[PDB]
Enzyme design. Structure first.
Site, mmCIF file in Angstrom:
data_model
loop_
_atom_site.group_PDB
_atom_site.id
_atom_site.type_symbol
_atom_site.label_atom_id
_atom_site.label_comp_id
_atom_site.label_asym_id
_atom_site.label_seq_id
_atom_site.Cartn_x
_atom_site.Cartn_y
_atom_site.Cartn_z
ATOM 1 N N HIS B 40 0.820 -1.221 0.000
ATOM 2 C CA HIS B 40 0.000 0.000 0.000
ATOM 3 C C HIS B 40 0.852 1.267 0.000
ATOM 4 O O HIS B 40 0.267 2.340 -0.135
ATOM 5 C CB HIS B 40 -1.005 0.011 1.142
ATOM 6 N N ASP B 84 0.618 -7.830 1.772
ATOM 7 C CA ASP B 84 0.976 -6.421 1.789
ATOM 8 C C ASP B 84 2.483 -6.262 1.814
ATOM 9 O O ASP B 84 3.102 -5.905 2.828
ATOM 10 C CB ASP B 84 0.298 -5.711 2.963
ATOM 11 N N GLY B 175 2.630 6.968 8.782
ATOM 12 C CA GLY B 175 3.994 7.338 8.419
ATOM 13 C C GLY B 175 5.023 6.273 8.720
ATOM 14 O O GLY B 175 6.152 6.375 8.213
ATOM 15 N N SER B 177 4.296 2.891 7.985
ATOM 16 C CA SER B 177 4.049 1.798 7.042
ATOM 17 C C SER B 177 5.238 1.487 6.174
ATOM 18 O O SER B 177 5.925 2.392 5.674
ATOM 19 C CB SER B 177 2.872 2.094 6.096
ATOM 20 N N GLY B 178 5.429 0.195 5.918
ATOM 21 C CA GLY B 178 6.504 -0.242 5.063
ATOM 22 C C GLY B 178 7.780 -0.511 5.810
ATOM 23 O O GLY B 178 8.682 -1.131 5.274
#
Ligand SMILES: [Ca+2]
Lengths: 58, 223
Positions: B40, B84, B175, B177-178
Site C-alpha cells: 500500500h 501487503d 507514516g 508503514s513499510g
C-alpha cells in the site's frame, strides 16, 4: 442519495502518511488530509484540481 | 511510532524513508539495490532516502536514490490487505557503510513473545498529530495468532501477525508503514495496518515476512 463529497475524510487503517485532498463543505474548499494508503472512500483526491472538479460547490 | 524513544542517529542503518516530495512510508534495505516495503506504499516517482536521521535537514550521511522498479506482490489484495509487501529496486546501488547497511531475511518464522524493534518517522500521538524530525524506535513483542484474531475478527490472514501491547500506548502509526519489525537481527515484519494507533485491545498488524522469503529472493534475482 448521500453526497460522498459531504463525508468526513477517511484515513483508514493502513499506516502510510500520504497527503490527499478532500472537499470540506463547512469551509467550501478542497483541503489536505492524511490518507493511510488503503480502503479510501470517495472524498479522497490526488490533486486539488480533481477535488474541485468532482466536489466543487457541494 | 507512539510510546517509543529516539533511536539515535543511524543506529537503525537498514531503515529507509520513501519520499514523493515528502516522507510517506518507511522501508528496509535488504541488499545494496533492493528495499522491502508495504504494497500500500506503492506510488510512482519514489525516491529512497538512506542514512537518514533528521528527515527535515540535510545532515551528512544521506544517500538519495530513485526507485527504478516498485514491484507489488502479485496477489496483494487492496480490500483484505493480504500480501501487503512490495520490493523496490534502487536505480543505482547504495554505498554501504556503518550508517547504510542491509538487514537479513529470516530463515524461520518468529514465535509469540519474541521481542522486536519497530522503527519509523510516523505519528507519535495516539490521538492527534505530531511527526518527528528524527527516527523513533519501539521494542514490542510478537503476539499469538489467537490474540490477533480475537482483536480483529475475520480480518487476520496467514500472512499477518500482531505485535505490541494490549493495554495501549505503544504502537506504529501513520507514516511508519513499510518499515521494519526486526527480531534477533532478522526482518520478520513490515508495518501494515491497525485500528487507530496505540489503542487498548488493538495491537498493530504486520506483514509476515517469513512467508515471503523464497518469493523475495527469486523476484529480486529476476529483476
Ligand atoms: Ca537528513
Amino acid at each position: 442519495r448521500p453526497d460522498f463529497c459531504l463525508e468526513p475524510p477517511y484515513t483508514g487503517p493502513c499506516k502510510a502518511r500520504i497527503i490527499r485532498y478532500f472537499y470540506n463543505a463547512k469551509a467550501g474548499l478542497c483541503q489536505t488530509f492524511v490518507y493511510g494508503g488503503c480502503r479510501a472512500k470517495r472524498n479522497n483526491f490526488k490533486s486539488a484540481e480533481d477535488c474541485m472538479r468532482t466536489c466543487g460547490g457541494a | 511510532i507512539v510510546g517509543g524513544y529516539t533511536c539515535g542517529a543511524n543506529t537503525v542503518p537498514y531503515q529507509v524513508s520513501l519520499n514523493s516530495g515528502y516522507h510517506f512510508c518507511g522501508g528496509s534495505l535488504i541488499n545494496s539495490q533492493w528495499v522491502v516495503s508495504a504494497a500500500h506504499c506503492y506510488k510512482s516517482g519514489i525516491q529512497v532516502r538512506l542514512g537518514e536521521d533528521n528527515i527535515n535537514v540535510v545532515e551528512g550521511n544521506e544517500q538519495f536514490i530513485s526507485a527504478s522498479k516498485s514491484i507489488v506482490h502479485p496477489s496483494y489484495n487492496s480490500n483484505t490487505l493480504n500480501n501487503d509487501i512490495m520490493l523496490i529496486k534502487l536505480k543505482s546501488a547504495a554505498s554501504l557503510n556503518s550508517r547504510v547497511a542491509s538487514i537479513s531475511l529470516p530463515t524461520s518464522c518468529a514465535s509469540a513473545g519474541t521481542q522486536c524493534l519497530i522503527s519509523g518517522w510516523g505519528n507519535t500521538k495516539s490521538s492527534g498529530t505530531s511527526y518527528p524530525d528524527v527516527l523513533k524506535c519501539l521494542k514490542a513483542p510478537i503476539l499469538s495468532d489467537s490474540s490477533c484474531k480475537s482483536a480483529y475478527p475475520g480480518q487476520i490472514t496467514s500472512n499477518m501477525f500482531c505485535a505490541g501491547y494490549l493495554e495501549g500506548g505503544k504502537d506504529s502509526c501513520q507514516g511508519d508503514s513499510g518499515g521494519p519489525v526486526v527480531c534477533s537481527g532478522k526482518l520478520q515484519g513490515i508495518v501494515s495496518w491497525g485500528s487507530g494507533c496505540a489503542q487498548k485491545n488493538k495491537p498493530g498488524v504486520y506483514t509476515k515476512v517469513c512467508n515471503y522469503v523464497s518469493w523475495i529472493k527469486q523476484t529480486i534475482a529476476s529483476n
